[PDB]
Amino acid sequence: YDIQAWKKQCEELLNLIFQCEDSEPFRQPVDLLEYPDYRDIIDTPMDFATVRETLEAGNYESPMELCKDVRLIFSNSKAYTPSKRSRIYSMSLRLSAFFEEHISSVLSDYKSALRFHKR
Numbered sequence: 001y002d003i004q005a006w007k008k009q010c011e012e013l014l015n016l017i018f019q020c021e022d023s024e025p026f027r028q029p030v031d032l033l034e035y036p037d038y039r040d041i042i043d044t045p046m047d048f049a050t051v052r053e054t055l056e057a058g059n060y061e062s063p064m065e066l067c068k069d070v071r072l073i074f075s076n077s078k079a080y081t082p083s084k085r086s087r088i089y090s091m092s093l094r095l096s097a098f099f100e101e102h103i104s105s106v107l108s109d110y111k112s113a114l115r116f117h118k119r
C-alpha cells in the first residue's frame with residue numbers, strides 16, 4: 001500500500017527497457033533530418049529518454065501518466081510505419097509486449113495503494 005513505490009518500479013523497468021536491443025530506435029527523439037516528414041505524420045513525438053527525464057524531474061504524478069507517454073512511443077511507431085513488417089515497427093511491438101507485461105503490476109499496486117489510502 002506504498003503509494004510512492006511506482007516511481008522506483010518505473011525507474012527499474014526503464015533501465016530494463018534501455019538494456020533491451022529492441023529499444024534502440026526509441027531511446028532518443030526521432031532524427032527529423034533522416035525522417036523529414038515524421039512531424040507531418042506524428043502530432044506528439046515521444047521517446048524513452050524523455051519519459052525517464054520526466055520521471056526523474058518529478059513531473060509524473062502517477063504511473064498511469066508514464067504509461068500514457070510510453071504507449072505514445074508505440075502508437076507513434078505504428079502510425080509512422082509504412083508496413084506492419086517494418087524492422088523498427090516490429091521492434092516496437094516486442095518492446096510494447098515486454099512493457100505491458102511489466103507495467104501491469106505497477107499500475108495494479110499503485111491503484112490498490114490509493115484505494116487503501118482513501119478507504
Ligand SMILES: O=C(NCC1CC1)N1CCN(C(=O)c2cccs2)CC1
Pocket residue numbers: 024025026027028029030031034035076077078080081082086088089092
Ligand atoms: O529515427 C528514429 N529514432 C532514432 C533515435 C535515436 C533514437 N526513429 C525513426 C522513426 N521510428 C519509427 O517508429 C519508424 C521508422 C520506420 C518504421 S516505424 C522510430 C524512431
